[PDB]
Amino acid sequence: IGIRDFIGGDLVKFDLGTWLSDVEEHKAIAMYSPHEGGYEGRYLNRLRYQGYHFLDVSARGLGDPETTLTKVHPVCPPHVGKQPIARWWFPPEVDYRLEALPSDAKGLVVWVIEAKVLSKAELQFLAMLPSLRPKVRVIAECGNWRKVMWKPLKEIAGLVPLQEA
Amino acid sequence: FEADITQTPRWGTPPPQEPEDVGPTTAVGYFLLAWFVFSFILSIALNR
Amino acid sequence: MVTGFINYGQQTIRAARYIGQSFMITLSHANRLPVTIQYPYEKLITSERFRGRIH
Amino acid sequence: VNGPEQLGNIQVPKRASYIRVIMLELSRIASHLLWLGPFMADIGAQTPFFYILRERELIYDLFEAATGMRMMHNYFRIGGVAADLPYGWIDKCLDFCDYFLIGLTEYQKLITRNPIFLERVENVGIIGGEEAINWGLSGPMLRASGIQWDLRKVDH
Amino acid sequence: YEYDIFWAFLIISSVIPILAFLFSGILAPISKGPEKLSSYESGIEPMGDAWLQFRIRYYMFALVFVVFDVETVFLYPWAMSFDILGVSVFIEALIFVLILIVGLVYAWRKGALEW
Amino acid sequence: AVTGVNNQEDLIWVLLKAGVVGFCYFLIMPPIIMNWLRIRWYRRNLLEMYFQFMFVFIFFPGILVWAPFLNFRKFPRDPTMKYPWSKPENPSEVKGGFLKYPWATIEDY
Amino acid sequence: MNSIEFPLLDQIAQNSVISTTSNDLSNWSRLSSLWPLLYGTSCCFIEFASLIGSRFDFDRYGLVPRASPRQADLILTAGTVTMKMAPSLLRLYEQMPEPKYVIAMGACTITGGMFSTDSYSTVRGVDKLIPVDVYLPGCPPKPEAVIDAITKLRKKISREIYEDRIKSQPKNRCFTINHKFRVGRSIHTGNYDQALLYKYKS
Amino acid sequence: MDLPGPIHDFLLVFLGSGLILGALGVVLFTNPIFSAFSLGLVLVCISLFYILANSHFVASAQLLIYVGAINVLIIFSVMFMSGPEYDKKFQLWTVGDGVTSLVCISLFVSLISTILNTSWYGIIWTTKSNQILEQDLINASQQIGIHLSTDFFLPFELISIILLVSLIGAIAVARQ
Amino acid sequence: FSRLEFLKEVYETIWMLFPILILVLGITIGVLVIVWLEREISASIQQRIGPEYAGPLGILQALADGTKLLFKENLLPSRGDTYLFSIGPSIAVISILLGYLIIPFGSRLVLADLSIGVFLWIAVSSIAPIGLLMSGYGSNNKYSFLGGLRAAAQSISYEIPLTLCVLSISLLSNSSSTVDIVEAQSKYGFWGWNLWRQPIGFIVFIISSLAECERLPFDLPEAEEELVAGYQTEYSGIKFGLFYVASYLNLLISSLFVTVLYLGGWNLSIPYIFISEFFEINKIDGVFGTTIGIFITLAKTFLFLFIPITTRWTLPRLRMDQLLNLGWKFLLPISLGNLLLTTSSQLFSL
Amino acid sequence: MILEHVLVLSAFLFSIGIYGLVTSRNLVRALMCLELILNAVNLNFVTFSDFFDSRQLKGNIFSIFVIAIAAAEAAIGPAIVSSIYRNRKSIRINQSNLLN
Numbered sequence A: 001i002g003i004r005d006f007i008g009g010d011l012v013k014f015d016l017g018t019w020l021s022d023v024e025e026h027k028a029i030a031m032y033s034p035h036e037g038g039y040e041g042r043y044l045n046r047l048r049y050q051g052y053h054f055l056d057v058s059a060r061g062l063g064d065p066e067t068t069l070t071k072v073h074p075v076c077p078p079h080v081g082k083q084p085i086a087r088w089w090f091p092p093e094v095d096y097r098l099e100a101l102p103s104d105a106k107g108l109v110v111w112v113i114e115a116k117v118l119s120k121a122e123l124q125f126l127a128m129l130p131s132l133r134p135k136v137r138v139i140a141e142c143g144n145w146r147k148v149m150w151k152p153l154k155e156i157a158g159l160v161p162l163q164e165a
Numbered sequence B: 001f002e003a004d005i006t007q008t009p010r011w012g013t014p015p016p017q018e019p020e021d022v023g024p025t026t027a028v029g030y031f032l033l034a035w036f037v038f039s040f041i042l043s044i045a046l047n048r
Numbered sequence C: 001m002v003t004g005f006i007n008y009g010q011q012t013i014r015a016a017r018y019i020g021q022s023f024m025i026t027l028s029h030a031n032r033l034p035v036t037i038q039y040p041y042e043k044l045i046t047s048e049r050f051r052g053r054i055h
Numbered sequence D: 001v002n003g004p005e006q007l008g009n010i011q012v013p014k015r016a017s018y019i020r021v022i023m024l025e026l027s028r029i030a031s032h033l034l035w036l037g038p039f040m041a042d043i044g045a046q047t048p049f050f051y052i053l054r055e056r057e058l059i060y061d062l063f064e065a066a067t068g069m070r071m072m073h074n075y076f077r078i079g080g081v082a083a084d085l086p087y088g089w090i091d092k093c094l095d096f097c098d099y100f101l102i103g104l105t106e107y108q109k110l111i112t113r114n115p116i117f118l119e120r121v122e123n124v125g126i127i128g129g130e131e132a133i134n135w136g137l138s139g140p141m142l143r144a145s146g147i148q149w150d151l152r153k154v155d156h
Numbered sequence E: 001y002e003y004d005i006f007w008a009f010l011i012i013s014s015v016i017p018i019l020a021f022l023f024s025g026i027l028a029p030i031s032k033g034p035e036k037l038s039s040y041e042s043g044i045e046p047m048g049d050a051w052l053q054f055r056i057r058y059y060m061f062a063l064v065f066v067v068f069d070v071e072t073v074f075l076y077p078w079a080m081s082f083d084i085l086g087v088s089v090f091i092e093a094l095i096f097v098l099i100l101i102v103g104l105v106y107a108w109r110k111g112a113l114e115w
Numbered sequence F: 001a002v003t004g005v006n007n008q009e010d011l012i013w014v015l016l017k018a019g020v021v022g023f024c025y026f027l028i029m030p031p032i033i034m035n036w037l038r039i040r041w042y043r044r045n046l047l048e049m050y051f052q053f054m055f056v057f058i059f060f061p062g063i064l065v066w067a068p069f070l071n072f073r074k075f076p077r078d079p080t081m082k083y084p085w086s087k088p089e090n091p092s093e094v095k096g097g098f099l100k101y102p103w104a105t106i107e108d109y
Numbered sequence G: 001m002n003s004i005e006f007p008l009l010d011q012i013a014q015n016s017v018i019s020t021t022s023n024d025l026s027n028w029s030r031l032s033s034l035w036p037l038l039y040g041t042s043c044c045f046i047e048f049a050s051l052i053g054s055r056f057d058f059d060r061y062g063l064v065p066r067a068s069p070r071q072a073d074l075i076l077t078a079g080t081v082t083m084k085m086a087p088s089l090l091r092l093y094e095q096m097p098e099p100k101y102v103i104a105m106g107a108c109t110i111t112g113g114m115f116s117t118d119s120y121s122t123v124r125g126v127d128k129l130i131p132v133d134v135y136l137p138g139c140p141p142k143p144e145a146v147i148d149a150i151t152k153l154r155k156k157i158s159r160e161i162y163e164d165r166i167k168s169q170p171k172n173r174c175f176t177i178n179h180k181f182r183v184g185r186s187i188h189t190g191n192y193d194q195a196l197l198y199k200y201k202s
Numbered sequence H: 001m002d003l004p005g006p007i008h009d010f011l012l013v014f015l016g017s018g019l020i021l022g023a024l025g026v027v028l029f030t031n032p033i034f035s036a037f038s039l040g041l042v043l044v045c046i047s048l049f050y051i052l053a054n055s056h057f058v059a060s061a062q063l064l065i066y067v068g069a070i071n072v073l074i075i076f077s078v079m080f081m082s083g084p085e086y087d088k089k090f091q092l093w094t095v096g097d098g099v100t101s102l103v104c105i106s107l108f109v110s111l112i113s114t115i116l117n118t119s120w121y122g123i124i125w126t127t128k129s130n131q132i133l134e135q136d137l138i139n140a141s142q143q144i145g146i147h148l149s150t151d152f153f154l155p156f157e158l159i160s161i162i163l164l165v166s167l168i169g170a171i172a173v174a175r176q
Numbered sequence I: 001f002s003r004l005e006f007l008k009e010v011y012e013t014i015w016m017l018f019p020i021l022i023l024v025l026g027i028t029i030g031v032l033v034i035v036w037l038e039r040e041i042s043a044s045i046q047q048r049i050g051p052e053y054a055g056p057l058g059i060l061q062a063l064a065d066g067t068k069l070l071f072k073e074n075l076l077p078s079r080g081d082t083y084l085f086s087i088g089p090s091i092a093v094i095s096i097l098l099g100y101l102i103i104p105f106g107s108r109l110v111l112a113d114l115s116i117g118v119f120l121w122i123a124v125s126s127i128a129p130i131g132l133l134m135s136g137y138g139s140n141n142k143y144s145f146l147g148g149l150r151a152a153a154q155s156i157s158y159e160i161p162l163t164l165c166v167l168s169i170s171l172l173s174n175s176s177s178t179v180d181i182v183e184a185q186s187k188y189g190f191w192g193w194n195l196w197r198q199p200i201g202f203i204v205f206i207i208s209s210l211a212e213c214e215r216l217p218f219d220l221p222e223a224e225e226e227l228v229a230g231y232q233t234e235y236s237g238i239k240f241g242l243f244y245v246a247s248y249l250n251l252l253i254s255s256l257f258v259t260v261l262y263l264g265g266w267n268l269s270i271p272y273i274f275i276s277e278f279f280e281i282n283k284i285d286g287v288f289g290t291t292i293g294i295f296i297t298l299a300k301t302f303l304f305l306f307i308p309i310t311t312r313w314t315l316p317r318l319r320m321d322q323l324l325n326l327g328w329k330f331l332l333p334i335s336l337g338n339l340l341l342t343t344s345s346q347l348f349s350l
Numbered sequence J: 001m002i003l004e005h006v007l008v009l010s011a012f013l014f015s016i017g018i019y020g021l022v023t024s025r026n027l028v029r030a031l032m033c034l035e036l037i038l039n040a041v042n043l044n045f046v047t048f049s050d051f052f053d054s055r056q057l058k059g060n061i062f063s064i065f066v067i068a069i070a071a072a073e074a075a076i077g078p079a080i081v082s083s084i085y086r087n088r089k090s091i092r093i094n095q096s097n098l099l100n
């Protein structure tokens, strides 16, 4: 395919109002971006302009995001043979950041990088997270594409039938 | 070792390095000489 | 005395030839296909015993 | 791996020894390449760095096919090696040798007689053989002073 | 006129770095710190401030260059008037070029041009 | 007019010729040049690369305008991926394992 | 409990055309020209060299290596940082002009790696010395993984606003006292192999 | 054959102010490097003055020769002086400078009381026949070439001898 | 104060400003082109791709570099002098930009056909090494000091053969104006180029211009392997970009002076042969003729832009002593002999 | 026009150069002030050639010769400076008063 494909993928498009309307209507959004990156900041920047504070979460070492994000979770710091095994308990990340945000902030946006490595049920929970926490928006890079396109995360995870764009 | 005469290396001859190609040298020299002679002739002819 | 100028001539043409040889050797690589793997649009398939993340 | 295996009198099988010789010579080729690169960069030519890397990547590919990693192979073991050579490695290494001979001829055509390279290199760092012996030099440093001293042929 | 364009071009060429400096001043941030303002000496802490004091025999070509610049400046008007006049200016400038060659030979033989 | 200028052309014809030159230089030729740079990027010899770079050097004032409004990002392997969330019909007709310069032809790019 | 706290700040700015697009274009310009420091210390630098070479190209992202810190945006710390080198590394980072970015490549730069256990001079991670933006795990990380870390760094760079500039300037607090220590001149004075033959002293 | 009037006078005033600043920097700087760099500003302003009057060849000759001279001067001031000495910075004032300041002020006043009292425009209208150029010599550099080659032959070879002997003496004196 | 001629002169100042601004815009665009071309030629002869992601084919890479340097914090040395630090690169870029006033892209597409011509170009190009020395001294760095001294020595060595080579061409064309030189070449057409008549001056001019542009193998004041960055070691932000622009502008102006003085400029015709294409090209006059002349000048300039960009990435670099030896013992006597041969051949004309 | 102002500047330069010739504690600076004085003389010559000698250009030729002489002096010293620094390792001229 060509014509439209080889015509401007410029970053001056007026998709930003639709992007903000979608991120307000659909709380959890799957995002697809150029492989070399750097064309996501135009869309996250305006979210940060509305008072949203970003929490960067890597999905590779996420480790069962239910108890990692919404519960106190046990983690063992790495001993190198010089110490006995210690079991530390870490606070729920998204809730700690939520209760520690300033009162003027619009909310918290969870930027889940490399969300393709998560399974189906983990993406289900990541899509249904804003229902449990009202002031949380979920953005998850579920892949790469020539141009930035976003979909509801419930549609990708399988809660909503995948309507043709 | 500076005052010792047995420290001078004596191991024969090294493996010779590849020989050299000299034909393109003469070709380049002929090209430049012809260029200079053509310059002489052209300057004399065009000046008149 | 003339032999000095002649030797200067032959040790100058040689340098020009070898400079042209370097130019030719380098510019002959313009006719060859690139070896560059265009990451991240292209990824090299790892070996059967590549040591990466633990499972 | 040959310190302790000599301490414990462990023998090495002939196939493992041949694999070790092949890998050592390949590593010597790679080390001489990635010496030639920074050397010509310090002289002033940056293109030979990429030119050596074009073939050092092939050496890395051979090592990763055999050992599992480009560098830090963890392939040599006490009394042998980690694993046998994979299927289709001999022909790949032979084709690499055939290509690398041509690449080395290209390197010698580009660099060896260059007038600027010679005039930067021809008469720097003259080391006597006696000084090379006394200073404890070895390898290409000691061998470039009239001394035919290689520990591969001395120690068998 | 053929030289008002020269003055306008010189003014514009001088203005351009001023515009670049002003744009950098109003665009780039300032985050100065005592470690940042230290002189760069490849990581290590610089010793005494710079200064090299070359040898004289190295920098003796400059005294040749001063004279040769004047000679090449003097050769230009003769070349401009070589066609209007004839062999007279050829004979005139032949001595100039010969003196230039003799001075170059003297500098070569005395070791002024040796490093 | 003034003494010194002689036989100057009419302004309307000069304007028309300059307009057609600008039309060919700013919005016609830079697209063909950048397409000739994108296609046949790996098929160049030394002469073709030299002429490509010469044409880019000449027409760069017209290419600097079109370049922000063009993307040349490489396309997916299968010609069925309409969307990044789309799945291939059968994942066997794709061609995987493109080779490179030591062991590849121009077909592998 | 090592807790976290947000300080008191004002409202940002809000803009329609000029400031927002200017910030976006500045971010994009700093995306595509992240010139590395050419800082090499140990074995990982070899893989860094493999990213300068032909098979994996630095030039596709821009990313031309610049020797001087003043011309470098990104410092890509490749190699173990010993006690003898860590002050030099921190100077080199400080001498780089703002905005500047740090990528800790290698396991020895994240937490010390193999030397995290018994080395008596290896700094266990440059996060104790310099603020690291992107951590790159792996002993000789694959050059593609280095490009991925640089891609993630670009992902974070493009998200910047003008407010982040006042997050970057140092607060610069100081406190000066007398020490009554013993002041001694430098041991390495530069005198080496000069008049060596007269230094026998039987 | 000139710039517009107000532009010409403004350029005169501006280049004069720059020349005054450069000369004051020359005679007030302790560092020979700083005063040499001020001398370079003086050289550039004087070349611009030459371009202003009519001298398009003398300006280029001034730029070339005097730029070589200042580059050599900076090199030999670096080579023949103590440490870089940014702290020297406007050498101190003595009585021996104060008396000479008065003497030079008196000399400048004596010169300017003559310059301001002489009608320089009156002399121009008397030298009418000296300002009728030959119509064939359009290029001013062509006229300067013709009048250097024909009118001044003896100084043209005397300067060659002078340059050769100066080169020889500079090499012989400065050699180690 | 006449308000009839004052408005006319204001509009005239506008109509001389307009060529200056379009030339300046094209000059900065050309610096962008030279950066992109050098990167892509290096990638091609090193079997790489080059800039690919900043724009379609790396077209916006140099623009991204320029805007990054604009947004990069301006860093001043605390130990050194601020005024010399700020003045140096500005002087270099001014003295390099001043040489573009006399370059003709057509018979009348020249900003100023000054009869002093190429001599003024040499005079203004002599000034930049003073700016380099100023940058070296003001930075208060040993590497910067060495780079400044090396730049001064390089300019001193290679100013004279270039001057004599330009003098020989001016003697052949009997005029210092660039338009006169190009037309004198265009009298005899393709055989009338000074490249064939003056080969020795051609080679010496190439070598001297490469040394003055400080391109490799004459990149000693900025040699990255010997000094960290040379005189640019302590320079950050927009000033390094200025010292980069000035270098690429010097390369472009040297290539333009190569195609003007030694090649035929905008001329492309062979009168001694029945070349239908060349005759039809030369038969066009007007707007199209000027456009074709600009095209020909740009192509001939790109040839001697391609050659030194290759030269940087092929040869090793010289040494300071060998640079001085080449400048003072191989180029200067040869240029003197070329001038003598030019005068002897020109004796036949009168 | 106000062309006579150039003359004024030349006179100023002369006086300033004269001042810099006397209070010079560095012989390189004294050489530079000699260049300043010769430059003032050259400014006078060039503006007088503009005023009265538009055809013969005798003032311009004299300016060229004065520039040549100034460069010859600038070549002879600092070679004299080189000899002085090689023999005494000091440049300050007022400190050398042996011959008195």
Ligand code: SF4
Binding pocket: G042, G043, G044, G078, G079, G080, G106, G107, G108, G109, G113, G114, G138, G139, G140
């Ligand atoms: S990861 Fe650490 S130990 Fe391994 S090569 Fe890199 S720096 Fe050395």
